[PDB]
Design an enzyme around this catalytic site. Structure first.
Site, PDB file in Angstrom:
ATOM      1  N   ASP A  21      38.356  51.274  34.756  1.00  0.00           N
ATOM      2  CA  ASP A  21      36.900  51.154  34.636  1.00  0.00           C
ATOM      3  C   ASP A  21      36.269  52.473  34.210  1.00  0.00           C
ATOM      4  OD1 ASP A  21      37.136  48.508  35.523  1.00  0.00           O
ATOM      5  OD2 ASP A  21      36.772  49.089  37.611  1.00  0.00           O
ATOM      6  N   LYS A  24      39.710  53.694  30.038  1.00  0.00           N
ATOM      7  CA  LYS A  24      41.051  54.040  29.582  1.00  0.00           C
ATOM      8  C   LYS A  24      41.316  53.528  28.175  1.00  0.00           C
ATOM      9  CE  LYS A  24      43.261  54.288  34.088  1.00  0.00           C
ATOM     10  NZ  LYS A  24      44.378  53.795  34.937  1.00  0.00           N
ATOM     11  N   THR A  25      40.845  52.319  27.864  1.00  0.00           N
ATOM     12  CA  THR A  25      41.076  51.742  26.543  1.00  0.00           C
ATOM     13  C   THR A  25      40.426  52.582  25.451  1.00  0.00           C
ATOM     14  OG1 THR A  25      39.115  50.320  26.513  1.00  0.00           O
ATOM     15  CG2 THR A  25      41.056  49.516  27.695  1.00  0.00           C
ATOM     16  N   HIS A  84      43.304  49.758  39.615  1.00  0.00           N
ATOM     17  CA  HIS A  84      43.229  48.469  40.304  1.00  0.00           C
ATOM     18  C   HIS A  84      44.262  48.388  41.433  1.00  0.00           C
ATOM     19  CE1 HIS A  84      40.021  46.846  38.087  1.00  0.00           C
ATOM     20  NE2 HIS A  84      40.677  46.480  37.002  1.00  0.00           N
TER      21      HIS A  84
END
Lengths: 393, 77, 203, 67, 80
Positions: A21, A24-25, A84
């Site tokens: 969140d 990272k992408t 996560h």
RNA sequence: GGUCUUGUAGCUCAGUCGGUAGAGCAACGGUCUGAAGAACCGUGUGUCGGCAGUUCGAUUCUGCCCGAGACCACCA
RNA sequence: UCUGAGAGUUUGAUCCUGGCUCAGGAUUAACGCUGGCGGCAUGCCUAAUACAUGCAAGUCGAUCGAAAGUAGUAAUACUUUAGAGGCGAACGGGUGAGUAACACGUAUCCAAUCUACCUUAUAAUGGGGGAUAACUAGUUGAAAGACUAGCUAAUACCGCAUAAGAACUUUGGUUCGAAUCAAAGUUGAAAGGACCUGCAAGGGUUCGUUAUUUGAUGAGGGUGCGCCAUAUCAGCUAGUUGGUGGGGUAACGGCCUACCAAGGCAAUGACGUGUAGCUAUGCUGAGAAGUAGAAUAGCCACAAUGGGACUGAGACACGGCCCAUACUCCUACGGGAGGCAGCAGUAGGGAAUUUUUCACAAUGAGCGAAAGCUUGAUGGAGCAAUGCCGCGUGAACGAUGAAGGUCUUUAAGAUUGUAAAGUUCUUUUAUUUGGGAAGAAUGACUUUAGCAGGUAAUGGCUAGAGUUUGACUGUACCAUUUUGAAUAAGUGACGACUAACUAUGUGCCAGCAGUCGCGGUAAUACAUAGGUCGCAAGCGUUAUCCGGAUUUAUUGGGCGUAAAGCAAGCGCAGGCGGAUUGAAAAGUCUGGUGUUAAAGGCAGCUGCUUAACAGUUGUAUGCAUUGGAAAC
């Protein structure tokens, strides 16, 4: 031609770490796009990281996805490590198959349990030379807080075993780099150079015959079951025998085809992150957490005794003892296996401190050898870490 | 597949055009012989039948059979 | 199986001997009944013409050191030729390479002769032979090896040879010639050929 | 594998077939069971025909105990 | 070659030009053993001249064989 | 490969946001039959798959796995 | 040349008939166990279920125009082909669902036919024209592609003169509807290239092309013969059966068409039903005969389905076309693209069966003046003990009998047991070094030596040379190559059938089992141990083939009481049937011929070192036919 791979540079495996969140992408896409200008075989991998439900529908990471990109000096195999919590079992798998570590932690959302657990896991796996890059630096009023984040990461590196002096703390933004702003792209260039200033290439040895550990297996139409992994020792050509270790007795098989992310090889040296299709093998016989090897030095066991550096409650470990029926899930190099702690005589509890060689029996036999680092987690937090030093069997 | 199929088809377009033209011209000559019977027109039919027999358009016996069945009614005179 | 693993026991139980009778006549107060923990007092469960026929077949094939498959295939091969099949077959039973060497008297056990022949230590007509199942022919030159003159068992048995007229040889160069067919007196008499040969009708 | 249903016997010691567990059948004639003339594979893929049947372990499926 | 694998044995092949290998032979004219030649090669050579006179031209590997048996020494003589 | 569900007596299943472990077969001591079975008076077994919060109270709340069960993977 | 086994099973107990099971091999084998290796063979029969990726048919610059690059100022020379021309693509590969009748095979007729390339002899290589591909400019389209205006070649195409001989008939000749001749009329051929010689003209050799034509070959058709079960299947058929005229056909032909008739098959089984590729062959028994139709070969159909048709000598065309059907793919939603029962390969089902392997080296084939190219054909490799064979899991000596275990259960012995240790030897294999096959005792390359009708020589026949064609090849094999007894056995049964016995346990509970039948508390049958027997680098199980099954009784049963004589009779067809004379040969027997593919079944020989395996030699029944026999 199956888009034959070409290699002329020292191959290393880099990987991004942190809490999901934070973007990272976008950071993975930014670094891939930055290194696309420095040389080909590099594309924007933003939506190429997702293959599972809710992994793309939400914009998060669940599994350890791999991409590749070469350069005029060095080749890199990037691995994405998710957050996560309760999915850490995935990211340690990336730790199983990475050489360099890039920390991605937000500034205004300074260190949470996720980041400290990731750094502690990187420590207990046996990977050195952590590299910290500050993200979301485009946020206004980052004068007194950027230095605070640098100090906190430098101090947190020492809190588990690393150091906060040898590696410079790079800073910049990835979303602006994703957009294509030249200044933040220059900052990403600087981060890549800092990576090039550390993390030496793996040693190339041929004396040890052959060893590889699978990350995952999948069906490929017209070919069959294809497994992934990375070579640890020795070389491998097309059409050689292999032995399968893990979760079952040793099973002899033969390889069929070697590729590197669907890029075929010709001479697979030690240390290459690749994948192989075998000859007449069932997908239910080779799974994630298994090992391919060559006869001469291998022996599987379930119960074994080794030293453990237990993590104190002050370090985030368990604050209470347990019994001989206490059953954590150890994470050996590439294997996530549950094992009870059948403590031998004169041992009935493992509290903070009292580092005594514990004996544990696992549900699945593993390729074991003295010096194999592994960790112990149960209850949601990691409770210990150790290495193999004694072989009963 | 075989790349030498479009070439065959394109050759066959012209081949079929020529063959259909020749056959329907022969048919026209047969109609002319039907509506009148003489010597010179039958000679023209002979010439056209042998033009067809020059190539593999007509079988070696088909032309003979048709001209024999034509001279069958020619022999009325 | 090629090698039984024991030779004395089979002769002890079937009431025959690998040699004529010297193999078992006295072995330090040796027994004479059929061996086994219960062959001392009870001796039969089903003994008849068929059972004794199988017994004679065993005493033959174990004496010649050939597997049962080999006996069946030799029976099939002798079916190819004419005449009195039993007599000719029994004549060829000692015509094997190791059998020929045994009749020369170079070794007291067919297993040893088999080892010598299959180790490539026997010379047949400018060609090394290691398969002890080669068909012979009246008038064939046979020799083992000059180099093997230093083998202690060969040297010990060189002077204590075996006198079998149907084959002639000289132990100076360990060389001889297969000349003529054998006969009944030259062959063991403790086995009835008839029962052995008539039992093979299935193939 | 088809809609046909056949009766069969459970040879060996004990019955471990448990209501939608996969089975393999076998032939053979018997006289003890009125209405049943079939046996089931005992010792392979679910059971073991225990062991020590050194005399017959190919039939009565059981891998040779290696020591 | 037909026979035991890794053991060549190829007899003469002079059949109609539109016939598959080892199909229905037009005729058998001797035999040939490529494994061991030199008195394992032979042709009948009796109806060979007639067969030559009726189609089935010799192939590349049998010209020497016809020259071996003297057929070529009487081949051009017969044509004239 | 992950997403969910399940685990309680020897067996099969009930086990209100904890207050008992509850039924059926097996089941043991008897009633009965020449005997086997049917029927009757009754025995009882239950560490709740394994660990820490938490409910004074963990088998009724969770997290983690363990054994098992099904659920979909991508797209030229 | 040749060859036939039986036993048990009813019952108080015996015999006869009669049934049941077992005792043999064998597979396109399967499960499980054991696991050394060489060679050989073999490795979807089930869902003709759809298929990722690549491939299995290309070829010829000397057939041609033109273009591109290179040497070259340029000319020209070399290399290459996007295309036109032609050849192959109609062979070659795989699968047996459909196909139950010329499906198949065999012999004849092919007077009812064809056959280009190849064979024999041989004619020509004249003359013109016009387009049109490549190309230039675009138009519609993410894409299949489609559309136009202009410019050029050819051995492309089109006419025309011409044309030995060929084809159609008119008159005549030979002749038992076929064959040739004589005369009359008519008809139709194109294309040269390459090289050499000659300063030119011109000439020479070769290639195909036309005009043929003697053959083989390939393709096609009819007939005699029989070639699954089906009487708890007796009527069926209206181009149906036959005649007439016309057309197609490679032909004869209701094949079709216009007309006219009402026929044809059948109780010696038609119509219809289920099943199925067939044959050679393979398996079984001594045998007649029974089984299946592995692989391998021929014939037949097929290319997801159903049709239609262009082409050409060869198609309704395994990797041509169109249409519709169904799926798949994408689709600016305009519309198209694909068809692995080819080598492989995935999924799925199935108990069940190998690689997205190597070279196209040998062979064959296609193309080509020529070098040459290609062939997932072809030959190999690997996996699988899937099957056969060979070969190892040592060997001599060595006991009043090592030790232990077992039985005896206890003063002891026996057994394991030459088995063990120990003494000694050596190495198929085990582990490896060096040398290292052949298959190139094929063909083509080059000058050549000789030679032929021709000479200036090409094209050609016979012999000589090599770099040329080696993945297999660390093959085979050889040299004590180094070390080296070191590298290696399990399995079913032990009451009988059926080779082998004792003991412990549970005690009609449990379990065995093919049957007789086992166990109601000492189980020669169960669970277990020891020992033994028998098989074996394979062992037992199911599934299914024939023997026994003479258990459909040609061989080889009958019908008084065990199963059957209609309830009895008359009697058609059919079957058999007194004697003599003569005929013939319809059947029968015999001699010649074709056929009965090869491999195999039989034996011999040779090459496999030997066996297996491969090759060679002679090798049946059968039909048609010639010449006879005339007892039946």
């Amino acid at each position: 031609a199956r888009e034959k791979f070409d290699r002329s540079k020292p191959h290393v495996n880099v990987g991004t770490i942190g809490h999901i969140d934070h973007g990272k992408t976008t950071l993975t896409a930014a670094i891939c796009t930055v290194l696309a200008k420095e040389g080909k075989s590099a594309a924007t991998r933003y939506d190429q990281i997702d293959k599972a439900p809710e992994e793309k529908a939400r914009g998060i990471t669940i599994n350890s996805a791999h991409v590749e990109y070469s350069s005029d000096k060095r080749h890199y195999a990037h691995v994405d490590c998710p957050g996560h919590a309760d999915y850490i079992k995935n990211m340690i798998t990336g730790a199983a198959q990475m050489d360099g570590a890039i920390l991605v932690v937000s500034a205004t959302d300074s260190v949470m349990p996720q980041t400290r657990e990731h750094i502690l896991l990187a420590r207990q796996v046996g990977v050195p030379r952590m590299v910290v890059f500050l993200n979301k630096c485009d946020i206004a009023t980052d004068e007194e807080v950027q230095e605070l984040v640098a100090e906190e990461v430098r101090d947190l590196l020492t809190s588990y075993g690393f150091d906060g002096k040898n590696t410079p703390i790079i800073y910049g933004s990835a979303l602006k780099a994703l957009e294509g702003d030249p200044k933040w792209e220059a900052k990403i260039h600087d981060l890549m150079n800092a990576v090039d200033e550390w993390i030496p290439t793996p040693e190339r040895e041929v004396d040890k015959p052959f060893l590889l550990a699978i990350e995952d297996t999948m069906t490929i139409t017209g070919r069959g079951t294809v497994v992934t992994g990375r070579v640890e020792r020795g070389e491998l050509k097309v059409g050689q025998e292999i032995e399968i270790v893990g979760l079952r007795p040793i099973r002899k098989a033969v390889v069929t085809g070697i590729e590197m992310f669907k890029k075929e090889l010709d001479s697979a040296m030690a240390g290459d992150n690749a994948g192989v299709l075998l000859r007449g093998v069932d997908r239910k016989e080779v799974e994630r957490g298994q090992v391919l090897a060559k006869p001469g030095s291998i022996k599987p066991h379930k119960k074994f005794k080794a030293e453990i550096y237990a993590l104190k409650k002050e370090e985030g470990g368990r604050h209470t003892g347990f019994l001989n029926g206490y059953r954590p899930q150890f994470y050996f190099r590439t294997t996530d296996v549950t094992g009870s702690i059948s403590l031998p005589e004169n041992t009935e509890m493992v509290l903070p401190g009292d580092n005594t060689s514990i004996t544990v029996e696992l549900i699945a036999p593993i390729a074991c050898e003295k010096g194999s680092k592994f960790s112990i987690r149960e209850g949601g937090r990691t409770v210990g870490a150790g290495s193999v030093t004694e072989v009963l069997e | 597949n075989i790349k030498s199929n479009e070439k065959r088809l394109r050759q066959n377009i012209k081949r079929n055009l020529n063959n259909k033209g020749q056959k329907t011209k022969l048919k026209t000559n047969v109609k002319n012989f039907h509506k009148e019977i003489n010597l010179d027109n039958l000679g023209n039919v002979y010439s056209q039948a042998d033009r067809l027999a020059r190539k593999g358009i007509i079988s070696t016996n088909r032309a003979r059979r048709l001209k024999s069945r034509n001279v069958a009614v020619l022999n009325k005179t | 199986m090629k090698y039984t693993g024991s030779i004395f026991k089979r002769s002890r139980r079937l009431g025959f001997s690998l040699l004529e009778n010297n193999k078992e006549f006295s072995k330090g107060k040796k027994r004479k009944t059929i061996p086994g923990q219960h062959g001392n007092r009870f001796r039969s469960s089903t003994m008849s013409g068929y059972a004794q026929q199988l017994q004679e077949k065993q005493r033959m094939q174990y004496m010649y050191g050939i597997t049962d498959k080999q006996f069946r295939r030799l029976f099939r091969l002798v079916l190819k030729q004419r005449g009195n099949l039993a007599v000719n077959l029994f004549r060829v039973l000692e015509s094997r390479l190791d059998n020929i060497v045994y009749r020369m008297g170079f070794a007291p056990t067919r297993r040893s002769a088999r080892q010598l022949v299959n180790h490539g230590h026997v010379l047949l007509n400018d060609r090394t032979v290691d398969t002890p199942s080669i068909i012979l022919n009246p008038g064939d030159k046979v020799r083992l090896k000059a180099k093997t003159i230093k083998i202690p068992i060969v040297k010990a048995a060189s002077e204590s040879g075996v006198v079998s007229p149907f084959v002639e040889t000289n132990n100076k160069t360990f060389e001889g010639t297969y000349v003529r067919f054998p006969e009944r007196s030259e062959l063991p008499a403790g086995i009835n050929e008839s029962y052995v040969v008539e039992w093979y009708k299935r193939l | 594998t088809n809609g046909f249903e056949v009766l069969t016997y459970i040879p060996g010691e004990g019955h471990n077939l448990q209501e939608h567990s996969v089975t393999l059948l076998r032939g053979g004639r018997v006289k003890d069971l009125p209405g049943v003339r079939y046996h089931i594979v005992r010792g392979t893929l679910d059971t073991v025909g225990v062991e020590k049947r050194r005399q017959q372990r190919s039939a009565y499926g059981a891998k040779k105990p290696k020591a | 070659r037909m026979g035991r694998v890794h053991y060549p044995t190829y007899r003469i092949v002079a059949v109609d030009s539109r016939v598959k290998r080892d199909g229905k032979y037009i005729a058998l004219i001797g035999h040939l053993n490529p494994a061991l030649k030199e008195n394992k090669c032979k042709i009948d050579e009796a109806v060979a001249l007639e067969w030559l006179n009726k189609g089935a031209k010799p192939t590349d590997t049998v010209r020497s064989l016809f020259s071996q048996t003297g057929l070529w020494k009487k081949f051009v003589e017969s044509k004239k």
